[PDB]
Amino acid sequence: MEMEKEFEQIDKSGSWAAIYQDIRHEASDFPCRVAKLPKNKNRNRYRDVSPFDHSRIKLHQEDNDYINASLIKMEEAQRSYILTQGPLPNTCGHFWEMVWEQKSRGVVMLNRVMEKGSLKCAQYWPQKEEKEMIFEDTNLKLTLISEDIKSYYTVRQLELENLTTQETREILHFHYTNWPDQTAPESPASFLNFLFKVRESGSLSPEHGPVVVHCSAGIGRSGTFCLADTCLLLMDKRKDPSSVDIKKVLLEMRKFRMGLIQTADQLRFSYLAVIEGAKFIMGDSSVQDQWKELSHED
Numbered sequence: 001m002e003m004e005k006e007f008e009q010i011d012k013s014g015s016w017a018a019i020y021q022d023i024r025h026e027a028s029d030f031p032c033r034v035a036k037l038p039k040n041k042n043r044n045r046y047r048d049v050s051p052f053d054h055s056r057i058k059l060h061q062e063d064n065d066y067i068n069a070s071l072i073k074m075e076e077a078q079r080s081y082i083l084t085q086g087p088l089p090n091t092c093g094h095f096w097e098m099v100w101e102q103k104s105r106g107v108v109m110l111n112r113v114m115e116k117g118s119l120k121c122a123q124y125w126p127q128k129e130e131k132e133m134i135f136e137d138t139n140l141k142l143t144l145i146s147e148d149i150k151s152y153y154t155v156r157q158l159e160l161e162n163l164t165t166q167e168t169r170e171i172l173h174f175h176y177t178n179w180p181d182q183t184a185p186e187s188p189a190s191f192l193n194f195l196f197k198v199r200e201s202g203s204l205s206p207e208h209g210p211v212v213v214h215c216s217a218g219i220g221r222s223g224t225f226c227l228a229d230t231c232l233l234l235m236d237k238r239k240d241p242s243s244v245d246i247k248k249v250l251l252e253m254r255k256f257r258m259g260l261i262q263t264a265d266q267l268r269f270s271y272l273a274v275i276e277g278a279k280f281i282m283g284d285s286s287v288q289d290q291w292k293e294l295s296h297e298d
């Protein structure tokens, strides 16, 4: 409600760049001494994007415990996410180890492997059923079980086997294929249709570990997805949208991972997605079918 009024005022004032910037000036600053250790240089995709020491995910095999990943633990919303960079050729083992050790059930991928003529993420999951991936270092096996390709996202069913214990888990892979970096999605509708497929799958249930979310750096598009979901869940818990302050939620998220939400436009989009998603949250069940038609999944 008041979230809507604020939105109209920022737009009628053009002050999104200012609003976004003072968010950056206010954002938490914590050390990342582990990420900056020389032995970990080749484990970071971007020199300037590192996990805080206090919230980083530790790998459990006791050689080197480092992976570029953060646990976003939203206390009030009672949802946790793991935000991580797109795996590098040499960290795909670590990535699936993290998935196993943290008991995650879903992976949300918000980037493509090639973006703007460069490799922004490694090909970390198998593309054909008959060629499984085995990660020798971490003792994990990854089979592609099935794949549902929609117009602007793809959902995949993967089998992850701990080759040590021979225990196997189903991992759901949710892959937004439509979303270039630094831009907002085309409409909130396709974005929300995707967020709500993730929600409906149970991958966000507290019975499982934290969902793993990544783009290339794991802050821009990944932060957009996480902020929208948490704001929606918050106003759902109170059934009082009036009381959700998106900026204060973003700044709480930024206590756990630097740089979440990378442009002013992504901030403005987050407002749009939450305002629109709240129509559903507050009892208009049929707006979800209405998002599905404007998404044009073919």
Ligand SMILES: [Mg+2]
Residues within 6 Å of the ligand: 115, 116, 179, 180, 181, 182
């Ligand atoms: Mg891009």
